[PDB]
Amino acid sequence: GSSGSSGDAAVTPEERHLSKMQQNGYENPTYKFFEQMQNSGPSSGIEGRGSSGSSGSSGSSGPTPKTELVQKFRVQYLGMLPVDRPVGMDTLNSAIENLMTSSSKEDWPSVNMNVADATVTVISEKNEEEVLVECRVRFLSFMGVGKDVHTFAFIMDTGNQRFECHVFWCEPNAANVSEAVQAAC
Secondary structure, eight states: OOOOOSOOSSOOHHHHHHHHHHHTOEEOHHHHHHHSOOOOOTTSSSOOOOOOOOOOOOOOOOSOOOOOOOEEEEEEEEEEEEOSOSSOHHHHHHHHHHHHHHSOTTTSOEEEEEEETTEEEEEESSOSSOOSEEEETTTOOEEEEOSSTTEEEEEEEOSSSOEEEEEEEESSOSHHHHHHHHHHO
16 A cells, blocks of 8 residues: 655644654553562562562452443454564554455454543444453553554553554544543553
């Protein structure tokens, strides 16, 4: 796909915001925190020997979940594209073209972006319990758009240092989407 306009008089307030996402993108801070978590360093002292190690998981309920509105957007699901890097405009984009050639524009099933409680869940158009894809912003490492604003992708973590890049088509542009998802971050 060859993108490029001949000229232009004035720039729209929607594009400008999209340009930024095209420059470098949006990196999630949390992800970083999850890695290096500040903790006490008692290392200092008269202790330099001994081997130990334990593990466990305690559970306890408290408050109750309440009803909270949600944001739903209309978009298509090109598919999932495996990557080697957690971030990088060259990694996310590359994936786009990959899925683009994989299936046609009509091949992509019309889905809906369910943005709630900082959770990105791609719910089918008709089916609500389909949960075609389940992504959590808190886990989202990097996200950005392709050469074209209409194309919107994002990188998510599944497990075992794994990263998946999903693409979605937005209309008219991915400005209302790239903004709704970011706010969740």
